[PDB]
Amino acid sequence: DIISVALKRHSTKAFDASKKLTPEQAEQIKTLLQYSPSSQNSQPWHFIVASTEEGKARVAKSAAGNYVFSERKMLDASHVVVFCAKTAMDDVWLKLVVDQEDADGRFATPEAKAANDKGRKFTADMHRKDLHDDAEWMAKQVYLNVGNFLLGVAALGLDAVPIEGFDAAILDAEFGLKEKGYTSLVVVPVGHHSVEDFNATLPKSRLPQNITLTEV
Amino acid sequence: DIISVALKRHSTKAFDASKKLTPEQAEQIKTLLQYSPSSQNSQPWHFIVASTEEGKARVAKSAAGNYVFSERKMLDASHVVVFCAKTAMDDVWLKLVVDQEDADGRFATPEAKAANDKGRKFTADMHRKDLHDDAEWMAKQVYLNVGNFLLGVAALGLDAVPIEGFDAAILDAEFGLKEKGYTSLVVVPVGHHSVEDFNATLPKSRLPQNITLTEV
Ligand SMILES: Cc1cc2nc3c(=O)[nH]c(=O)nc-3n(C[C@H](O)[C@H](O)[C@H](O)COP(=O)(O)O)c2cc1C
Ligand SMILES: Cc1cc2nc3c(=O)[nH]c(=O)nc-3n(C[C@H](O)[C@H](O)[C@H](O)COP(=O)(O)O)c2cc1C
Ligand SMILES: O=C(O)c1cccnc1
Ligand SMILES: O=C(O)c1cccnc1
């Protein structure tokens, strides 16, 4: 049951390098990334999934120097996911999304398709022209994906840790993301915790609902 | 089976007003809100849970103007959750979080507690003093919570729809959020879909992994 999952999941502080995702699990984590919801189904994201030693080493370059504590997590986990946001919402992407919805049979008529496209452009233009927050808006959808992913992987019986503790400039440069139109936001190592994971045995802590939650 | 949940969940376009959350479900959705992870366990959020006719009507004020299509969703769902972010990360909140971790037994020594506080302040100060993006940083954690919540509620067998299509100024004013130190970001009606939910029967559409996903 999902509440048990939410109450028992934790941020893993150390991974067992010998314990790999099964082939099926490796496919399932990709499914989770793909099928996250997003505003206007804008899907303003790219994922780097590192599963080779070479690949994980490249991601771990972002943790060198000041973020060194993050390196072992990135190197010892089975699979490491880099969540990236688009840096601009371009017309090519908008067309890609609506054309895909059309290919998947979501529109009964050309008018319905046109209306969907118009609505998505309205929202996108509002963020870029009026709110001046389009980069932030897209990054928010990526964080939503991350939240979906963390619960999803826990429910698959996998350990994980979300990481903001890395140098995004280094990671962006390593994978040439800027030129491709993306920027790295969160790194999520996924695998199985080791006996050295001190956080596996500690009680969860959250503020009480009397502070955070109002019922009306 | 969480993958089945992810593949089958959808954004509900119309709710059956007669179909209420069970008492236990109403508690479980609150648990999901509370137990979401966040960077440094900063939990920079407040939730309004509207379950009365009066309460939902107050939220539905925000579906004015361009956002009229959101009104029925907000009024007809069993429970409506307003996800809010803090407007600034203050020292009182940082102390609240570490003191709660201490009360929950996460620190073996005063030194461990002090180290946790120091680490949290380092990260928080980076955002508020250097990047001047603490508002954005906090809003990102809230969107992560939303992602967790949407999958969680689906796994409970509940329908939902995330909504950016509302007037945050109207909502903030209605609940006096600004003065309390919060701002509304996403509204999530939760309940059961009606036969009028045209999105319940439509195929789900996502961009292919050959565009969005790189394996290394
Ligand atoms: C942050 C966010 C905001 C959304 N806002 C709205 C909204 O205002 N109205 C609406 O009908 N759908 C809204 N949606 C639903 C999206 O259109 C939907 O998630 C997307 O088309 C993918 O479809 P699915 O959720 O059925 O998988 C929102 C989704 C997200 C993630
Ligand atoms: C966006 C985000 C970034 C995080 N970055 C790190 C990190 O860099 N290093 C780390 O050890 N934990 C990191 N965490 C884990 C949090 O400390 C953790 O989620 C929080 O303390 C709650 O504990 P739990 O995840 O075990 O429930 C991050 C969490 C989130 C949501
Ligand atoms: O996804 C949608 O349908 C949507 C998102 C934002 C605002 N209005 C609609
Ligand atoms: O939650 C953490 O431990 C954390 C968050 C951001 C950066 N470094 C650590």
Numbering used by the authors:
A (entry chain B), B (entry chain A): 2 to 217
What did the publication describing this PDB structure actually write?
The enzyme is a homodimer of two 24 kDa subunits with an extensive dimer interface. The two active sites are on opposite sides of the long central helix at the dimer interface, and the FMN is bound to residues from both monomers.
The most active mutant selected was T41Q/N71S/F124T. While the N71S is the only mutation at position 71 that enhances the activity of the protein for CB1954, the F124T mutation is not the most active mutation at position 124, and the T41Q mutation by itself reduces the activity of the protein for CB1954. The mutations together, therefore, show synergistic effects. In this study, structures of the double and triple mutant were both determined with and without bound nicotinic acid. In the triple mutant, the N71S mutation is the same as in the double mutant; position 41, however, is now a Gln, which is larger than the wild-type threonine and more polar than the leucine of the double mutant, while F124 has been replaced by threonine. In the structures of the free and nicotinate-bound triple mutant, the Q41 side chain forms a hydrogen bond to the T124 hydroxyl group, pulling the residue slightly closer than in the wild-type protein.
